[PDB]
Motif scaffolding. Structure first.
Motif, PDB file in Angstrom:
ATOM      1  N   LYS A 151       0.860  -1.214   0.000  1.00  0.00           N
ATOM      2  CA  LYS A 151       0.000   0.000   0.000  1.00  0.00           C
ATOM      3  C   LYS A 151       0.878   1.239   0.000  1.00  0.00           C
ATOM      4  O   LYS A 151       1.581   1.523   0.979  1.00  0.00           O
ATOM      5  N   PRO A 152       0.959   1.992  -1.152  1.00  0.00           N
ATOM      6  CA  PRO A 152       1.923   3.111  -1.182  1.00  0.00           C
ATOM      7  C   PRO A 152       1.727   4.111  -0.032  1.00  0.00           C
ATOM      8  O   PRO A 152       2.684   4.614   0.544  1.00  0.00           O
ATOM      9  N   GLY A 153       0.461   4.369   0.289  1.00  0.00           N
ATOM     10  CA  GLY A 153       0.095   5.369   1.292  1.00  0.00           C
ATOM     11  C   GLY A 153       0.431   4.956   2.708  1.00  0.00           C
ATOM     12  O   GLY A 153       0.351   5.815   3.620  1.00  0.00           O
ATOM     13  N   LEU A 154       0.803   3.693   2.927  1.00  0.00           N
ATOM     14  CA  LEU A 154       1.250   3.217   4.234  1.00  0.00           C
ATOM     15  C   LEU A 154       2.761   3.397   4.406  1.00  0.00           C
ATOM     16  O   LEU A 154       3.196   3.326   5.557  1.00  0.00           O
ATOM     17  N   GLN A 155       3.547   3.532   3.348  1.00  0.00           N
ATOM     18  CA  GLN A 155       5.013   3.428   3.455  1.00  0.00           C
ATOM     19  C   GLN A 155       5.553   4.486   4.425  1.00  0.00           C
ATOM     20  O   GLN A 155       6.502   4.187   5.112  1.00  0.00           O
ATOM     21  N   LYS A 156       5.018   5.713   4.415  1.00  0.00           N
ATOM     22  CA  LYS A 156       5.563   6.778   5.308  1.00  0.00           C
ATOM     23  C   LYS A 156       5.419   6.309   6.781  1.00  0.00           C
ATOM     24  O   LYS A 156       6.249   6.664   7.575  1.00  0.00           O
ATOM     25  N   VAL A 157       4.334   5.630   7.086  1.00  0.00           N
ATOM     26  CA  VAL A 157       4.163   5.063   8.433  1.00  0.00           C
ATOM     27  C   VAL A 157       5.226   3.999   8.706  1.00  0.00           C
ATOM     28  O   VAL A 157       5.884   4.068   9.722  1.00  0.00           O
ATOM     29  N   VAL A 158       5.334   3.026   7.821  1.00  0.00           N
ATOM     30  CA  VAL A 158       6.292   1.890   7.936  1.00  0.00           C
ATOM     31  C   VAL A 158       7.678   2.501   8.223  1.00  0.00           C
ATOM     32  O   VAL A 158       8.422   2.016   9.035  1.00  0.00           O
ATOM     33  N   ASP A 159       8.063   3.528   7.446  1.00  0.00           N
ATOM     34  CA  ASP A 159       9.456   4.039   7.478  1.00  0.00           C
ATOM     35  C   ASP A 159       9.802   4.776   8.768  1.00  0.00           C
ATOM     36  O   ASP A 159      10.969   4.941   9.015  1.00  0.00           O
ATOM     37  N   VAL A 160       8.830   5.210   9.568  1.00  0.00           N
ATOM     38  CA  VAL A 160       9.172   5.918  10.827  1.00  0.00           C
ATOM     39  C   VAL A 160       9.182   4.932  12.012  1.00  0.00           C
ATOM     40  O   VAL A 160       9.542   5.328  13.136  1.00  0.00           O
ATOM     41  N   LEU A 161       8.733   3.675  11.838  1.00  0.00           N
ATOM     42  CA  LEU A 161       8.539   2.773  12.978  1.00  0.00           C
ATOM     43  C   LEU A 161       9.877   2.520  13.703  1.00  0.00           C
ATOM     44  O   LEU A 161       9.863   2.333  14.945  1.00  0.00           O
ATOM     45  N   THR A 205     -19.871   3.679  17.837  1.00  0.00           N
ATOM     46  CA  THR A 205     -20.554   3.221  16.606  1.00  0.00           C
ATOM     47  C   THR A 205     -19.487   2.681  15.694  1.00  0.00           C
ATOM     48  O   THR A 205     -18.618   3.443  15.223  1.00  0.00           O
ATOM     49  N   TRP A 206     -19.470   1.379  15.487  1.00  0.00           N
ATOM     50  CA  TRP A 206     -18.509   0.723  14.608  1.00  0.00           C
ATOM     51  C   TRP A 206     -18.995   0.829  13.151  1.00  0.00           C
ATOM     52  O   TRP A 206     -20.125   0.497  12.885  1.00  0.00           O
ATOM     53  N   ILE A 207     -18.048   1.169  12.294  1.00  0.00           N
ATOM     54  CA  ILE A 207     -18.294   1.193  10.828  1.00  0.00           C
ATOM     55  C   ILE A 207     -17.139   0.391  10.250  1.00  0.00           C
ATOM     56  O   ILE A 207     -16.018   0.881  10.264  1.00  0.00           O
ATOM     57  N   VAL A 208     -17.396  -0.800   9.766  1.00  0.00           N
ATOM     58  CA  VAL A 208     -16.344  -1.712   9.279  1.00  0.00           C
ATOM     59  C   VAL A 208     -16.508  -1.825   7.742  1.00  0.00           C
ATOM     60  O   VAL A 208     -17.540  -2.269   7.286  1.00  0.00           O
ATOM     61  N   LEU A 209     -15.460  -1.435   7.066  1.00  0.00           N
ATOM     62  CA  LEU A 209     -15.513  -1.467   5.601  1.00  0.00           C
ATOM     63  C   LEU A 209     -15.416  -2.902   5.080  1.00  0.00           C
ATOM     64  O   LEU A 209     -14.631  -3.722   5.565  1.00  0.00           O
ATOM     65  N   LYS A 210     -16.196  -3.186   4.039  1.00  0.00           N
ATOM     66  CA  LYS A 210     -16.187  -4.535   3.470  1.00  0.00           C
ATOM     67  C   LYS A 210     -14.894  -4.812   2.709  1.00  0.00           C
ATOM     68  O   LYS A 210     -14.423  -5.924   2.664  1.00  0.00           O
ATOM     69  N   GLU A 211     -14.411  -3.820   1.980  1.00  0.00           N
ATOM     70  CA  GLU A 211     -13.250  -4.054   1.120  1.00  0.00           C
ATOM     71  C   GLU A 211     -11.953  -3.881   1.888  1.00  0.00           C
ATOM     72  O   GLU A 211     -11.710  -2.809   2.444  1.00  0.00           O
ATOM     73  N   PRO A 212     -11.118  -4.911   1.949  1.00  0.00           N
ATOM     74  CA  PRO A 212      -9.849  -4.766   2.621  1.00  0.00           C
ATOM     75  C   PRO A 212      -8.866  -3.947   1.794  1.00  0.00           C
ATOM     76  O   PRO A 212      -9.037  -3.822   0.584  1.00  0.00           O
ATOM     77  N   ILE A 213      -7.840  -3.417   2.412  1.00  0.00           N
ATOM     78  CA  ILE A 213      -6.677  -2.885   1.697  1.00  0.00           C
ATOM     79  C   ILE A 213      -5.618  -3.981   1.674  1.00  0.00           C
ATOM     80  O   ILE A 213      -5.562  -4.839   2.552  1.00  0.00           O
ATOM     81  N   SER A 214      -4.787  -3.890   0.639  1.00  0.00           N
ATOM     82  CA  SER A 214      -3.628  -4.791   0.474  1.00  0.00           C
ATOM     83  C   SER A 214      -2.360  -4.086   0.969  1.00  0.00           C
ATOM     84  O   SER A 214      -2.109  -2.936   0.579  1.00  0.00           O
ATOM     85  N   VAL A 215      -1.584  -4.767   1.803  1.00  0.00           N
ATOM     86  CA  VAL A 215      -0.237  -4.313   2.209  1.00  0.00           C
ATOM     87  C   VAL A 215       0.774  -5.382   1.825  1.00  0.00           C
ATOM     88  O   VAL A 215       0.382  -6.585   1.726  1.00  0.00           O
ATOM     89  N   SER A 216       2.044  -5.051   1.761  1.00  0.00           N
ATOM     90  CA  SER A 216       3.025  -6.099   1.413  1.00  0.00           C
ATOM     91  C   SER A 216       3.514  -6.860   2.650  1.00  0.00           C
ATOM     92  O   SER A 216       3.442  -6.388   3.778  1.00  0.00           O
ATOM     93  N   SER A 217       4.060  -8.029   2.420  1.00  0.00           N
ATOM     94  CA  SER A 217       4.724  -8.793   3.492  1.00  0.00           C
ATOM     95  C   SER A 217       5.788  -7.920   4.171  1.00  0.00           C
ATOM     96  O   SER A 217       5.888  -7.925   5.382  1.00  0.00           O
ATOM     97  N   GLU A 218       6.536  -7.137   3.416  1.00  0.00           N
ATOM     98  CA  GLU A 218       7.607  -6.308   4.008  1.00  0.00           C
ATOM     99  C   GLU A 218       6.999  -5.236   4.914  1.00  0.00           C
ATOM    100  O   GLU A 218       7.578  -4.911   5.972  1.00  0.00           O
TER     101      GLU A 218
END
Ligand SMILES: COP(=O)(OC)[C@H](Nc1ccc(S(N)(=O)=O)cc1)c1ccc([C@@H](Nc2ccc(S(N)(=O)=O)cc2)P(=O)(OC)OC)cc1
Ligand SMILES: [Zn+2]
Length: 258
Positions: A151-161, A205-218
Protein backbone atom coordinates in the motif's frame (compact mmCIF):
# COMPACT_ATOMS: atom_id res chain seq x y z
CA UNK A 1 0.58 -6.33 36.58
CA UNK A 2 -1.28 -4.07 34.02
CA UNK A 3 -3.27 -5.24 31.04
CA UNK A 4 -1.78 -6.42 27.76
CA UNK A 5 -1.78 -9.29 25.27
CA UNK A 6 0.38 -11.92 27.10
CA UNK A 7 -0.70 -15.30 28.70
CA UNK A 8 -0.82 -13.63 32.07
CA UNK A 9 -2.46 -10.25 31.27
CA UNK A 10 -4.34 -10.87 27.99
CA UNK A 11 -8.01 -10.45 26.96
CA UNK A 12 -9.23 -13.41 29.17
CA UNK A 13 -7.93 -11.50 32.27
CA UNK A 14 -9.28 -7.99 31.48
CA UNK A 15 -12.69 -8.58 33.18
CA UNK A 16 -11.05 -8.57 36.61
CA UNK A 17 -10.02 -4.88 36.38
CA UNK A 18 -12.68 -3.91 33.79
CA UNK A 19 -15.89 -5.88 34.47
CA UNK A 20 -17.61 -4.21 31.43
CA UNK A 21 -15.46 -6.73 29.47
CA UNK A 22 -18.46 -9.08 29.93
CA UNK A 23 -20.99 -6.34 28.98
CA UNK A 24 -23.87 -6.23 26.49
CA UNK A 25 -22.17 -4.26 23.70
CA UNK A 26 -18.52 -5.42 23.53
CA UNK A 27 -16.28 -5.30 20.49
CA UNK A 28 -15.00 -6.74 18.27
CA UNK A 29 -17.56 -9.18 16.87
CA UNK A 30 -17.77 -11.71 14.08
CA UNK A 31 -19.68 -10.30 11.11
CA UNK A 32 -21.94 -13.06 9.78
CA UNK A 33 -22.46 -11.84 6.20
CA UNK A 34 -25.60 -14.00 5.81
CA UNK A 35 -27.28 -12.55 8.99
CA UNK A 36 -26.37 -8.83 8.45
CA UNK A 37 -29.37 -7.05 6.91
CA UNK A 38 -29.14 -4.40 4.16
CA UNK A 39 -30.64 -1.22 5.66
CA UNK A 40 -31.77 0.99 2.72
CA UNK A 41 -32.21 3.96 5.18
CA UNK A 42 -28.45 4.26 6.10
CA UNK A 43 -27.21 7.56 4.62
CA UNK A 44 -24.24 7.79 2.29
CA UNK A 45 -20.92 7.78 4.45
CA UNK A 46 -18.90 11.03 4.23
CA UNK A 47 -15.13 10.76 4.94
CA UNK A 48 -13.79 14.36 4.79
CA UNK A 49 -10.02 14.13 5.33
CA UNK A 50 -8.72 16.84 2.88
CA UNK A 51 -7.85 19.28 5.80
CA UNK A 52 -6.44 16.57 8.12
CA UNK A 53 -3.44 17.75 10.17
CA UNK A 54 -1.30 14.81 11.50
CA UNK A 55 1.06 15.79 14.36
CA UNK A 56 2.88 12.85 15.94
CA UNK A 57 3.30 9.09 16.04
CA UNK A 58 3.50 7.37 19.46
CA UNK A 59 4.31 3.82 20.61
CA UNK A 60 1.94 3.50 23.56
CA UNK A 61 3.03 -0.02 24.54
CA UNK A 62 -0.11 -1.60 22.97
CA UNK A 63 0.02 -0.28 19.36
CA UNK A 64 1.22 2.91 17.69
CA UNK A 65 -1.06 5.90 17.25
CA UNK A 66 -0.85 8.55 14.52
CA UNK A 67 -2.34 11.58 16.23
CA UNK A 68 -4.16 14.48 14.57
CA UNK A 69 -5.07 18.08 15.50
CA UNK A 70 -8.77 17.75 16.55
CA UNK A 71 -8.99 21.27 18.17
CA UNK A 72 -11.12 22.33 15.05
CA UNK A 73 -13.37 20.57 12.41
CA UNK A 74 -10.58 19.50 10.03
CA UNK A 75 -10.80 15.76 9.30
CA UNK A 76 -14.37 14.56 9.97
CA UNK A 77 -16.61 11.55 9.51
CA UNK A 78 -20.35 12.09 8.94
CA UNK A 79 -23.31 10.28 7.36
CA UNK A 80 -23.84 6.56 7.34
CA UNK A 81 -25.40 5.56 10.64
CA UNK A 82 -24.09 8.76 12.31
CA UNK A 83 -25.97 11.80 13.58
CA UNK A 84 -23.74 14.91 13.64
CA UNK A 85 -20.04 15.41 13.17
CA UNK A 86 -17.23 13.15 14.35
CA UNK A 87 -13.64 14.52 14.43
CA UNK A 88 -10.60 12.32 13.63
CA UNK A 89 -8.31 12.17 16.67
CA UNK A 90 -5.97 9.25 15.82
CA UNK A 91 -5.52 6.04 13.91
CA UNK A 92 -3.78 2.81 14.85
CA UNK A 93 -3.64 -0.83 13.87
CA UNK A 94 -3.95 -4.31 15.42
CA UNK A 95 -1.92 -7.11 13.81
CA UNK A 96 -0.72 -10.67 14.15
CA UNK A 97 2.46 -12.68 14.41
CA UNK A 98 1.45 -14.55 11.21
CA UNK A 99 -0.60 -13.44 8.17
CA UNK A 100 -3.56 -15.70 9.19
CA UNK A 101 -4.38 -13.68 12.33
CA UNK A 102 -4.37 -10.07 13.57
CA UNK A 103 -7.75 -8.50 12.86
CA UNK A 104 -10.21 -7.86 15.66
CA UNK A 105 -13.37 -8.07 13.70
CA UNK A 106 -13.82 -11.24 11.61
CA UNK A 107 -15.98 -11.86 8.55
CA UNK A 108 -17.66 -15.27 8.55
CA UNK A 109 -14.95 -16.23 11.09
CA UNK A 110 -12.17 -15.14 8.66
CA UNK A 111 -9.30 -13.32 10.38
CA UNK A 112 -7.36 -10.76 8.33
CA UNK A 113 -3.63 -10.01 8.83
CA UNK A 114 -4.36 -6.68 10.49
CA UNK A 115 -7.05 -4.06 11.12
CA UNK A 116 -6.85 -0.27 10.91
CA UNK A 117 -8.93 1.83 13.31
CA UNK A 118 -9.59 5.48 12.52
CA UNK A 119 -10.97 6.91 15.75
CA UNK A 120 -13.39 9.84 15.77
CA UNK A 121 -15.34 11.62 18.50
CA UNK A 122 -18.75 13.33 18.45
CA UNK A 123 -18.24 17.10 18.58
CA UNK A 124 -21.58 17.57 20.50
CA UNK A 125 -19.69 16.33 23.63
CA UNK A 126 -16.93 18.98 23.38
CA UNK A 127 -13.87 16.74 24.15
CA UNK A 128 -12.86 13.10 23.69
CA UNK A 129 -12.92 12.33 27.43
CA UNK A 130 -16.58 13.45 27.65
CA UNK A 131 -17.41 11.57 24.43
CA UNK A 132 -16.22 8.17 25.75
CA UNK A 133 -18.84 8.45 28.53
CA UNK A 134 -21.71 8.52 25.98
CA UNK A 135 -23.33 5.66 24.01
CA UNK A 136 -22.91 7.68 20.78
CA UNK A 137 -19.58 9.30 21.66
CA UNK A 138 -17.18 7.68 19.20
CA UNK A 139 -17.21 6.41 15.64
CA UNK A 140 -14.44 4.04 14.66
CA UNK A 141 -13.86 3.26 11.00
CA UNK A 142 -12.35 -0.24 10.75
CA UNK A 143 -10.47 -1.34 7.64
CA UNK A 144 -9.09 -4.86 7.13
CA UNK A 145 -5.55 -5.47 5.84
CA UNK A 146 -4.58 -8.48 3.74
CA UNK A 147 -1.05 -9.31 2.61
CA UNK A 148 -0.35 -8.98 -1.09
CA UNK A 149 0.68 -5.83 -3.05
CA UNK A 150 2.22 -2.91 -1.08
CA UNK A 151 0.00 0.00 0.00
CA UNK A 152 1.92 3.11 -1.18
CA UNK A 153 0.09 5.37 1.29
CA UNK A 154 1.25 3.22 4.23
CA UNK A 155 5.01 3.43 3.45
CA UNK A 156 5.56 6.78 5.31
CA UNK A 157 4.16 5.06 8.43
CA UNK A 158 6.29 1.89 7.94
CA UNK A 159 9.46 4.04 7.48
CA UNK A 160 9.17 5.92 10.83
CA UNK A 161 8.54 2.77 12.98
CA UNK A 162 12.32 2.24 13.59
CA UNK A 163 12.29 5.62 15.45
CA UNK A 164 9.48 4.55 17.84
CA UNK A 165 10.53 0.98 18.53
CA UNK A 166 9.78 0.95 22.25
CA UNK A 167 6.97 2.03 24.56
CA UNK A 168 6.81 5.77 25.22
CA UNK A 169 8.80 6.80 22.14
CA UNK A 170 7.24 9.35 19.79
CA UNK A 171 8.25 11.15 16.63
CA UNK A 172 7.07 14.18 14.67
CA UNK A 173 4.60 12.94 11.97
CA UNK A 174 3.28 15.98 10.14
CA UNK A 175 1.67 16.16 6.70
CA UNK A 176 0.47 12.52 6.57
CA UNK A 177 -2.69 12.04 4.45
CA UNK A 178 -4.95 9.29 5.81
CA UNK A 179 -6.91 9.21 2.51
CA UNK A 180 -4.06 7.01 1.26
CA UNK A 181 -5.12 4.23 3.67
CA UNK A 182 -8.72 3.85 2.32
CA UNK A 183 -9.97 1.22 -0.12
CA UNK A 184 -11.86 2.18 -3.28
CA UNK A 185 -15.36 1.26 -1.90
CA UNK A 186 -16.94 2.72 1.27
CA UNK A 187 -19.47 -0.17 1.52
CA UNK A 188 -19.70 -1.05 5.26
CA UNK A 189 -21.26 -2.94 8.13
CA UNK A 190 -22.27 -1.05 11.24
CA UNK A 191 -23.25 -2.00 14.83
CA UNK A 192 -23.07 -0.48 18.35
CA UNK A 193 -20.07 -1.63 20.39
CA UNK A 194 -17.11 -0.71 22.49
CA UNK A 195 -13.47 0.15 22.72
CA UNK A 196 -11.55 -3.09 22.00
CA UNK A 197 -8.95 -2.41 24.74
CA UNK A 198 -9.36 -1.40 28.37
CA UNK A 199 -11.25 0.56 29.53
CA UNK A 200 -13.64 -1.26 27.08
CA UNK A 201 -16.17 1.60 27.26
CA UNK A 202 -19.47 1.01 25.38
CA UNK A 203 -19.29 4.27 23.47
CA UNK A 204 -18.57 3.30 19.80
CA UNK A 205 -20.55 3.22 16.61
CA UNK A 206 -18.51 0.72 14.61
CA UNK A 207 -18.29 1.19 10.83
CA UNK A 208 -16.34 -1.71 9.28
CA UNK A 209 -15.51 -1.47 5.60
CA UNK A 210 -16.19 -4.54 3.47
CA UNK A 211 -13.25 -4.05 1.12
CA UNK A 212 -9.85 -4.77 2.62
CA UNK A 213 -6.68 -2.88 1.70
CA UNK A 214 -3.63 -4.79 0.47
CA UNK A 215 -0.24 -4.31 2.21
CA UNK A 216 3.02 -6.10 1.41
CA UNK A 217 4.72 -8.79 3.49
CA UNK A 218 7.61 -6.31 4.01
CA UNK A 219 5.21 -3.63 5.34
CA UNK A 220 3.58 -5.92 7.96
CA UNK A 221 7.03 -7.38 8.90
CA UNK A 222 8.01 -3.85 10.01
CA UNK A 223 4.93 -3.68 12.25
CA UNK A 224 6.11 -6.94 13.88
CA UNK A 225 9.55 -5.43 14.73
CA UNK A 226 7.96 -2.96 17.15
CA UNK A 227 8.28 -3.65 20.89
CA UNK A 228 5.72 -3.74 23.69
CA UNK A 229 8.62 -3.06 26.17
CA UNK A 230 10.30 0.18 26.99
CA UNK A 231 13.90 1.04 26.03
CA UNK A 232 16.54 -0.92 27.94
CA UNK A 233 14.01 -3.70 28.89
CA UNK A 234 14.00 -7.31 27.57
CA UNK A 235 12.57 -7.40 24.07
CA UNK A 236 8.91 -8.44 23.64
CA UNK A 237 7.87 -8.08 20.04
CA UNK A 238 4.64 -6.11 19.49
CA UNK A 239 2.57 -8.86 17.78
CA UNK A 240 -0.92 -10.28 18.32
CA UNK A 241 -2.25 -7.06 19.85
CA UNK A 242 -5.86 -7.98 18.97
CA UNK A 243 -8.91 -8.90 21.10
CA UNK A 244 -10.92 -11.89 19.85
CA UNK A 245 -14.59 -11.65 18.81
CA UNK A 246 -17.09 -11.11 21.65
CA UNK A 247 -20.69 -12.22 21.97
CA UNK A 248 -23.13 -10.32 19.75
CA UNK A 249 -25.92 -10.48 22.35
CA UNK A 250 -28.96 -8.30 21.52
CA UNK A 251 -27.38 -6.55 18.51
CA UNK A 252 -28.01 -6.42 14.82
CA UNK A 253 -25.26 -5.75 12.30
CA UNK A 254 -26.53 -3.65 9.39
CA UNK A 255 -25.10 -3.57 5.83
CA UNK A 256 -24.96 -0.40 3.72
CA UNK A 257 -25.02 -2.52 0.54
CA UNK A 258 -27.40 -5.01 -1.19
C1 LIG B 1 -5.06 6.56 26.74
O1 LIG B 1 -5.48 5.66 25.63
P1 LIG B 1 -6.52 6.07 24.52
O2 LIG B 1 -6.07 5.93 23.15
O3 LIG B 1 -7.01 7.58 24.71
C2 LIG B 1 -6.31 8.80 24.25
C3 LIG B 1 -7.93 4.96 24.88
N1 LIG B 1 -8.80 5.01 23.74
C4 LIG B 1 -8.93 3.93 22.83
C5 LIG B 1 -9.28 4.36 21.59
C6 LIG B 1 -9.67 3.49 20.61
C7 LIG B 1 -9.70 2.13 20.89
S1 LIG B 1 -10.21 1.01 19.63
N2 LIG B 1 -9.12 -0.21 19.47
O4 LIG B 1 -10.24 1.78 18.38
O5 LIG B 1 -11.48 0.48 20.05
C8 LIG B 1 -9.33 1.67 22.13
C9 LIG B 1 -8.95 2.58 23.10
C10 LIG B 1 -8.61 5.36 26.18
C11 LIG B 1 -7.97 5.14 27.37
C12 LIG B 1 -8.47 5.65 28.57
C13 LIG B 1 -9.63 6.38 28.59
C14 LIG B 1 -10.15 6.98 29.88
N3 LIG B 1 -10.60 5.96 30.80
C15 LIG B 1 -11.89 6.01 31.28
C16 LIG B 1 -12.36 4.95 32.04
C17 LIG B 1 -13.61 4.99 32.62
C18 LIG B 1 -14.40 6.11 32.43
S2 LIG B 1 -16.06 6.07 32.98
N4 LIG B 1 -16.12 6.79 34.41
O6 LIG B 1 -16.42 4.68 33.14
O7 LIG B 1 -16.82 6.87 32.06
C19 LIG B 1 -13.95 7.18 31.68
C20 LIG B 1 -12.70 7.13 31.10
P2 LIG B 1 -9.09 8.18 30.73
O8 LIG B 1 -7.62 8.01 30.58
O9 LIG B 1 -9.67 9.48 30.09
C21 LIG B 1 -9.67 9.64 28.66
O10 LIG B 1 -9.59 8.15 32.23
C22 LIG B 1 -8.92 7.33 33.22
C23 LIG B 1 -10.29 6.59 27.40
C24 LIG B 1 -9.79 6.08 26.21
ZN1 LIG C 1 -8.20 -0.36 17.82
Amino acid sequence: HHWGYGKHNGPEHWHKDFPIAKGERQSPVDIDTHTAKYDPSLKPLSVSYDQATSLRILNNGHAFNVEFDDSQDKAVLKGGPLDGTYRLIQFHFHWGSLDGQGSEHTVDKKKYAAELHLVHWNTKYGDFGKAVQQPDGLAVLGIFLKVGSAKPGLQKVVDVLDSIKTKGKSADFTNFDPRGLLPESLDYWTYPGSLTTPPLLECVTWIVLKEPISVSSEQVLKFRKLNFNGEGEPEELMVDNWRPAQPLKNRQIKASFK
